[model samples]
Target: EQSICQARAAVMVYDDANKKWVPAGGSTGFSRVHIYHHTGNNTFRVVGRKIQDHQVVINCAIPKGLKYNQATQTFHQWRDARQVYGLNFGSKEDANVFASAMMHALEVL
Candidate 1:
């Protein structure tokens, strides 16, 4: 088992049809992300906390690539590449912390 990294930051989901990123319809407009392990499940959990339903986002696992863009400081997570969900980590170094953590967690999976 690995330690949980509960991180709070600015985050949003992408709306490809609208060609924009949107908040959770009226949240604080920030998401809290964390990693969790399901017992014997062979997969890791990465989620973002939000409102509207008051819970859930980015359960993509490493079906999540954490696909980030250097130019925009944004992301495009890929489950199948047909369309995507996105987020931000505020800056480069900030995102690196989870890139490291998530990459390591991928090894666990």
Candidate 2:
């Protein structure tokens, strides 16, 4: 049997000191992120609320050409001569899970 999953995943923020992405958190702690997949829209929307500042960050229309690397737990998209970092996950499992969902969504379209 096949099941359709909604947009949901753990989130992470870039850590300059560690040169890696860490779970999105601060003094007030972390929050789960929701990724809205717009089938045939060629864009994935990401939204999350920050606990510390109670700020809502909404990034929309992320390109479908982005690629995910499990080892780095990051999403990469090429822009001309550079590789842009779209999103990062604290855990490989999280990355894999989200990647699987994104791939499935793409396939359905």
Candidate 3:
């Protein structure tokens, strides 16, 4: 039982300091981040967004690599160590980033 990868979906970023999920590009919209589940090159497309007079330009929205949280059932869009940001799906249907989770029956690497 396997379905196509659902990782390639829109995601919203959170700002712990701002006390909530602040839009990376400020309400313009979330970036439909693409994940690279390679053997080692597992990283986000980018990190940090730029705000110019409400110009929604997300330059690097993610610097380090992201991790998969099966328990929370969401994606970790931050530094693998100290970063406290997270990339969440817009809905439940788009939260399944485990195309191989059930297919290969392998543990979270």
Best by lDDT: 1
Candidate 3, 20-70: lDDT as tens digits: 655555564444433333445433333223223434333332233234344
Model 1 lDDT, residue 66, Cα: 43
- Inter-residue clash pairs, candidate 1: none
Better candidate by lDDT, 1 or 2: 1
Clashes of 1: 0
| TM-scores for every candidate against the unseen true structure | 0.63, 0.46, 0.41
- Model 2, span 1-109: residue lDDT tens: 1223322333455555778655543323343445566555545555655545655543433355544444455442222122223344445565566567656654644
Give all candidate RMSDs, comma-separated: 3.9, 6.2, 7.5
User: Backbone collision count in every prediction?
Assistant: 0, 0, 7
What TM-score does structure 3 among the candidates reach?
0.41
lDDT of 2: 0.46
Off by over 4 Å in 1: 1-3, 25-28, 51-54, 64-83, 90-93
Better of 2 and 3 by TM-score: 2
Point to the candidate with the largest TM-score: 1
